[PDB]
Ligand binder design. Structure first.
Ligand SMILES: [Ca+2]
Ligand SMILES: [Ca+2]
Length: 757
DNA sequence: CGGACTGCTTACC
DNA sequence: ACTGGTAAGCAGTCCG
């Protein structure tokens, strides 16, 4: 299997490395045969020498076009011949481009921003993570003596924990008499050991939890301030601290640094993303968090260091088990997208999509359109019509069928050949005119995106067939990841169309996909209500909830199945309606907010404060019970009673504080904020004390007793002390518990005043 | 000024 | 930073 690619500068020339593992051994295949390239379009072909006259001033010597050649390519299908200007070293590519472009002879520059290492893998047609090879992994984690708003590295590392299949051990420089602890002389000695342990083990993968933005950055500052060759790489290299927008990433050249945080953060929805949280969320088992006030008092005292050690070890053990679970599927994405596990795991859907296109575009001899200019991005800042959302028939209904189109937007993109290279073509024999947007789509040649989207779905069925066959549960797991990911990559293409930063941006394409969506869902609802006696209780983009009011469950089901048999043949191309749920009873509140309970008793909840992570657990828990009380059981009184108890408990300060915690994400740079919420207020106060409240940070806080602004009474959850200051029973009554409960109970002719204690 | 409007902000579907 | 459509609350805005 191939791990990743980079290049070293062997005596002026660049040498491409292909880090791999085959025959149970790690190899480094070098390659000096590859040369950088970049496409240019001149107005008059003859004057290629005049353009080649353009040199570029670089920090290291001078640079000029090593060679050139006319390449017969295509651009949005329409053939286009271009000058492919080669270069001696790739670092000269970004120097001589702003000049080579600006030149009045050259029309435009194309494919100038693709990294050399990644470019090689695209052209050679090599696929990271292929073929069954067992990769050894090693998890590691650190415990530091943190104080309030110190400089990052000022505190020394007390412990370093590591974990793998065989064991989990702790390296520290204070006497802790436990079998899994290794006591060194000093902090410098603890690290010097940890570095041996890695080397002696020689693992392919290094697993961390937020290792990119903390653990690796911290160890460097320590190793720097102590004078240590922090050499973790197989080539004996120090870790690279490369930047990635608001955050950084960390490269261990020779090994795969797998940081779980960006994966976990982008895969599971949780209020907090503490390692203690995700372990419970993924595995079910609990995990104790030994805090900094504890860690410090232990170090300073020497008293309870055995407890601080159990934490250090667990942190690693957990970190390893999370890695061993998530790494498999992230490896399948490495193969699918065509770039490294390192890149893939740190990338957005926009990038993973764009990397998929660049690869399939090369194979197809399609010249990749450039990322948008600062001016261009603002030129394409115009929103469009989205999905249809029917205003719900509010109330408590019985016997609901839920119908929805199988993969709507991708089915529309393939069926109507919605591509940027099929949009308003010159003299196609056959054309598809989109309903409201009016944009015509050519039907003579399969479009670039539709074609690939076709192949993806084509393959997803090949993989789901090989699954039913595959006897090995290990293969049946790895096959499932492949097809589950393909489906996500498939439904991502419409969004990539509407994405201003995207290479293959197409406002017309996006607007037309949604436009058809509306045509079809509305025509189903119309047929379902007219041709058949159904009442559509609710709908949203591609699905609907319906019933025959008086009818029984058996009848609803039959007549619903009858409808599919009727409608589906009248629908065009890949568009096909599906029966995907029956519910004994259902409760629709507002657009986006509703709950159902199936024949077997499982309540499904959508939109309501229960599922929202910016609501106190008591409000959510309260709503959840005052919702079960009306659905699972038909006792509207029970809900009245439940609400009346949860109020008095809050009134008599008997509700545990943990349940009163309110989580809100800080989205942008704190200074940029216009208006101040309670969660911004807390962030601005913590910023004065030098807490790292950066974009992506979650503000956990409790509202304290008083009056005026809710934000000026807001303190961090960590810093709540029952003895010192109490909580605001008025807030968690009037602003949380009562509202969420009244949403459900308002339909049963109850007032808010009624439910209070 | 004690109410109703309106804009900012977050997280959901 | 993959989209648009939507609920809902905080904390200011207007106005008689
Ligand atoms: Ca549903
Ligand atoms: Ca579906």
């Amino acid at each position: 299997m191939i791990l990743d690619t980079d290049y070293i500068t062997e005596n002026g020339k660049p040498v491409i490395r292909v880090f791999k593992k085959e025959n149970g051994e790690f190899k480094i295949e070098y390659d000096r045969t590859f040369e950088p390239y970049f496409y240019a379009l001149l107005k008059d072909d003859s004057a290629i020498e005049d353009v080649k006259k353009v040199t570029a001033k670089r920090h290291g010597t001078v640079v000029k076009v090593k060679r050139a050649e006319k390449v017969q390519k295509k651009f949005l299908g329409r053939p286009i011949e271009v000058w492919k200007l080669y270069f001696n070293h790739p670092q000269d590519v970004p120097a001589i481009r702003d000049r080579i472009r600006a030149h009045p002879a050259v029309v435009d520059i194309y494919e100038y921003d693709i990294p050399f290492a990644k470019r090689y893998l695209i052209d050679k047609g090599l696929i990271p993570m292929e073929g069954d090879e067992e990769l050894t992994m090693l998890a590691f984690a650190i415990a530091t003596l943190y104080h309030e708003g110190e400089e990052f590295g000022t505190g020394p590392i007390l412990m370093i924990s590591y974990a793998d299949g065989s064991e989990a051990r702790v390296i520290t420089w204070k006497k802790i008499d436990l079998p899994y602890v290794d006591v060194v002389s000093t902090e410098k000695e603890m690290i010097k050991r940890f570095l041996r342990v890695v080397r002696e083990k020689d693992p392919d993968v290094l697993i961390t939890y937020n290792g990119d933005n903390f653990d690796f950055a911290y160890l460097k500052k320590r190793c720097e301030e102590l004078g240590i060759k922090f050499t973790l790489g197989r080539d004996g290299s120090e870790p690279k601290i490369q930047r990635m927008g608001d955050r950084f990433a960390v490269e261990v050249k020779g090994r795969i640094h797998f940081d779980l945080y960006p994966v976990i953060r982008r895969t599971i929805n949780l209020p907090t993303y503490t390692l203690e949280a995700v372990y419970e969320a993924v595995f079910g088992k609990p995990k104790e968090k030994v805090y900094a006030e504890e860690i410090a008092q232990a170090w300073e005292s020497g008293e309870g260091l055995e407890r601080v050690a159990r934490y250090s070890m667990e942190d690693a053990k957990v970190t390893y088990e999370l890695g061993r679970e998530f790494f498999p599927m992230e490896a399948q994405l490495s193969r699918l997208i065509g770039q490294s596990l390192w890149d893939v795991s740190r990338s957005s859907t926009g990038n993973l999509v764009e990397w998929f296109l660049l690869r399939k575009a090369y194979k197809r001899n399609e010249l990749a359109p450039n990322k948008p200019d600062e001016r261009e991005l603002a030129r394409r800042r115009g929103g469009y019509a989205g999905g249809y959302v029917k205003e719900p028939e509010r109330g408590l209904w019985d016997n609901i069928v839920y119908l929805d189109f199988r993969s709507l937007y991708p089915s529309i993109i393939i069926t109507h050949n919605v591509s940027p290279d099929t949009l308003n073509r010159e003299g196609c024999k056959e054309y598809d005119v989109a309903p409201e947007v009016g944009h015509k789509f050519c039907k003579d040649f399969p479009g670039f995106i539709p074609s690939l989207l076709g192949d993806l779905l084509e393959e997803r069925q090949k993989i789901k067939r090989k699954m039913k066959a595959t006897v090995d549960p290990l293969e049946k797991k790895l096959l499932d990841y492949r097809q589950r990911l393909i489906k996500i990559l498939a439904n991502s293409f419409y969004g990539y169309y509407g994405y201003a930063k995207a290479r293959w941006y197409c406002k017309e394409c996006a607007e037309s996909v949604t436009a058809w969506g509306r045509e079809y869902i509305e025509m189903v609802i119309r047929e379902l209500e007219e041709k058949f006696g159904f009442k559509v209780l609710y709908a949203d983009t591609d699905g609907l909830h319906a019933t025959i009011p008086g009818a029984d469950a058996e009848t609803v089901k039959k007549k619903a199945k009858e409808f599919l048999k009727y409608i589906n043949p009248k629908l065009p191309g890949l568009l096909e309606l599906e029966y995907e749920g029956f519910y004994v009873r259902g409760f629709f509140v507002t657009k986006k907010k509703y709950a159902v309970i199936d024949e077997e008793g499982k309540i499904t909840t959508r939109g309501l404060e229960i599922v929202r992570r910016d609501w106190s657990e008591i409000a959510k828990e309260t709503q959840a019970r005052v919702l079960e009380a009306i659905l699972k059981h038909g006792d509207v009184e029970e809900a009245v009673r439940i609400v009346k108890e949860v109020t008095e408990k809050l009134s008599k300060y008997e509700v545990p504080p943990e349940k009163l915690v309110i989580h809100e994400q800080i989205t942008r740079d704190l200074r940029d904020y216009k208006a101040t919420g309670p969660h911004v207020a807390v962030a601005k106060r913590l910023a004065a004390r030098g807490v790292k409240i950066r974009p992506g940070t979650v503000i956990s806080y409790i509202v304290l007793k008083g009056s005026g602004r809710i934000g000026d009474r807001a303190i961090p959850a960590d810093e709540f002390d029952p003895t010192k200051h109490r909580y605001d029973a008025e807030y968690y009554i009037e602003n949380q518990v009562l509202p969420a409960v009244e949403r459900i109970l308002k339909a049963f002719g109850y007032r808010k005043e009624d439910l209070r204690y």
